[PDB]
Design a protein around this ligand. Sequence first.
Ligand SMILES: CC(C)(COP(=O)(O)OP(=O)(O)OC[C@H]1O[C@@H](n2cnc3c(N)ncnc32)[C@H](O)[C@@H]1OP(=O)(O)O)[C@@H](O)C(=O)NCCC(=O)NCCS
Ligand SMILES: O=C([O-])CC(=O)C(=O)O
Ligand SMILES: O=C([O-])CC(=O)C(=O)O
Lengths: 434, 434
Amino acid sequence: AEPDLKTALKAVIPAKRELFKQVKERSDEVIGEVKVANVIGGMRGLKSMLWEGSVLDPEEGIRFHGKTIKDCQKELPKGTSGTEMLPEAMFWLLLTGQVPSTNQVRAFSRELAEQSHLPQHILDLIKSFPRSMHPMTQLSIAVAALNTESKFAKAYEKGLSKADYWEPTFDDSISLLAKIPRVAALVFRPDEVDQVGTQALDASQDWSYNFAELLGKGGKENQDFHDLLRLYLALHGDHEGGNVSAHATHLVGSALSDPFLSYSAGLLGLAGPLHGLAAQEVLRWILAMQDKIGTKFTDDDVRNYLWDTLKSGRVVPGYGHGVLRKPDPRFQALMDFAATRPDVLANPVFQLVKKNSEIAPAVLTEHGKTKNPHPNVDAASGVLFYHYGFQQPLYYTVTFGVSRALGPLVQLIWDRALGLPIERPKSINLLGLK
Amino acid sequence: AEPDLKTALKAVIPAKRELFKQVKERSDEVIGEVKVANVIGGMRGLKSMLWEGSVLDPEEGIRFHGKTIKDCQKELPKGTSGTEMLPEAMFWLLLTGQVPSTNQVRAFSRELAEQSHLPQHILDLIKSFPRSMHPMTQLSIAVAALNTESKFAKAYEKGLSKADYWEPTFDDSISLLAKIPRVAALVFRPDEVDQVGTQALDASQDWSYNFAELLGKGGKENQDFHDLLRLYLALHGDHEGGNVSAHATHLVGSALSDPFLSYSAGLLGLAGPLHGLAAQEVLRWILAMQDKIGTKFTDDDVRNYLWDTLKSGRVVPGYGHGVLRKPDPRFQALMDFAATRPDVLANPVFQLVKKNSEIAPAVLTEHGKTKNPHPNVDAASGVLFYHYGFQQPLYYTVTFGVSRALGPLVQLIWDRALGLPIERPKSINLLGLK
Ligand SMILES: CC(C)(COP(=O)(O)OP(=O)(O)OC[C@H]1O[C@@H](n2cnc3c(N)ncnc32)[C@H](O)[C@@H]1OP(=O)(O)O)[C@@H](O)C(=O)NCCC(=O)NCCS
Ligand SMILES: O=C([O-])CC(=O)C(=O)O
Ligand SMILES: O=C([O-])CC(=O)C(=O)O
């Protein structure tokens, strides 16, 4: 058979180490400036961390190994059904720097199906959560609770050579990826943990398909949604190093905490309103707007709701970005998915999202606080799930949490392979700056 | 009755905001350079974050608002019994910039007693943990699980003004502080969850005293241990912004995740071997040396064990530091605690720690691989707990986790009070650095 992912990674490791050596010779090379703004403004614009799989252009948007989203949509393998790029193929790309063949991805999806099962204690833990516990809180906990299955933690404790750190990190990463949809499904379905937690996946099917099965949207009749999920999971997988979830995963990982604990920290970061919880917050905000402005509304009604939101000392969710100064191509990608489906375009909630994207940038510019008045991917993602029957926005960031495992787990594997050190910036007080 | 903590904070908030405004006017001022080393070396030496409560003097050691450890030991209030500075008084110092009066601290200790109780679901959750689950994994989870009691998360979800962020953040911080010893005690004592989890605390007693009671080390016969615990908790509270636990808390907090989720991320960073486990590693290392060299050993016996450790390509635990170039004043503080206790000084294990601190720096310098040959606080802390009957080193990072809530929760309160933005640097790949 064609080489598997671990083998494909191993071929690429020596070349990366040689490049690391070459970059390291120019350690002393000056590349930028640190100003007072960078210190007080959350490190904004400070090129200070290494991320390999993706680099974000402020104007262009994200590239994955120099490939655009449309490039990935074209080149990455599809599933047995549908037209959308598989997230697992994206993972393969992110890790190796190479587009996998369809056969390689089929083999890789099978492995992911095989490793989905959970230890009973994870089921008992999830069963202990009160119904009112926030879903991202539950997801974060369960992922950290899976550190009992960590080969890296156990192997680090025994004694481990630095050169081989990546292998247990890789094993744990693949393990977590396989499991996280099922865990996510348990969060979605608290009354059915015994069944959901043990039900067999379709071994022939891809990761997204299987996630949908666990969500109770399996089968041919749900194939449109499978394509959306594949697309969605692939788009959110990675978005360079500086975003809070990626960063947190790497920061905690750098102290040699294993991937279950590290990505759990990521998930906690992703649960923040300013980060991934915005997917949730966008749709709550859109539903509230709809409730106030009604079924037939003017442009001014939307303008007023936005301005009232801002004058309340609250943000407009789904607009602005730490780096992007243009509309997010991930956002456009989800709108283009909607563009070919008349039933999605006929959904009033989608239409409200569309209408808001033609008004909110002007209002945010008039307000004059933000660097980026344009929509981000969170503006569009919730409504699509809503359309396919996922109507509880408190759960939307959970699906993000499944996706966002992809990129950061890749970087952790590389972090360990290159022997990158603990992350430890220098802090300073206000009086020291004055 | 004198001003309470919240009121004392409120008096100092407007002065901090005015200073922030003044520093902000010089945003464009250049303070440093970014080199290739900073990107590949975990941002080492890069002045890139704000931390108010503490500044590490590289040669003189940590200072808390410009006060040295000895200054804090002298000026900060003690408990109803004992001679060691109270950690809650350190929290007061860190937050307000001022030494509290004894009365002020008594009132604050009463509040912490009153708020220590946990919801029943946290007891069920901890009861579900498998006996094999690592203690820092358990502590991290339970702290995140306490986000069901987050006033910040619930108030953010209802709609809240950015200007009003700090109060709910402060309320959650005090709430988490009250609870975290009890949670920690539950991790220590899995067979006593029903009793430990529900027992009423003496409101007239201090935080450390009550933590020791929950540990089963209450009462007059254990008064020396109460003082050790007080001292220890106060010293480990805060150590600038750049350390992984502090940083993670701030990073996740910056996305507007609540203090329970943010500090949980901290605790996950603390679980990393490179960050939190050194106290554990020191004691295991010392016990191995003792097993070989006995309790009646010469200086050469210790030298040989050190040299063997180094020639095996391993570190000597508790020596060296990322930033400090001198012996840690926290380390000196703990040795001086032993200086007035003849029973501690008579303990062969303590004596081995003492003898190793005379020998190891010379050996480490001769070896020549290490920049900082001097002892850090982790060198001394484990032995002291061991002497008072806590002889499972696997649990020593848990007690660190209780301490390390102090500094980062303070900074979060300040982060919200100042309206600091999300932490979001830019990343770059190796090919981009070439
Ligand atoms: C994404 C976000 C956190 C970027 O943060 P940032 O890079 O620090 O933002 P800026 O540099 O543009 O911030 C400058 C000011 O504009 C405000 N601002 C930025 N985007 C905003 C938005 N969409 N709505 C309202 N205010 C916004 C900031 O809060 C800040 O105001 P303050 O100083 O009074 O607090 C920010 O756009 C925001 O919080 N709103 C978007 C919420 C969201 O969709 N999150 C997911 C982003 S992918
Ligand atoms: O990760 C995301 O989707 C958003 C992002 O890039 C950021 O927060 O900077
Ligand atoms: O702290 C570390 O392990 C790295 C370091 O600063 C040193 O080389 O001494």
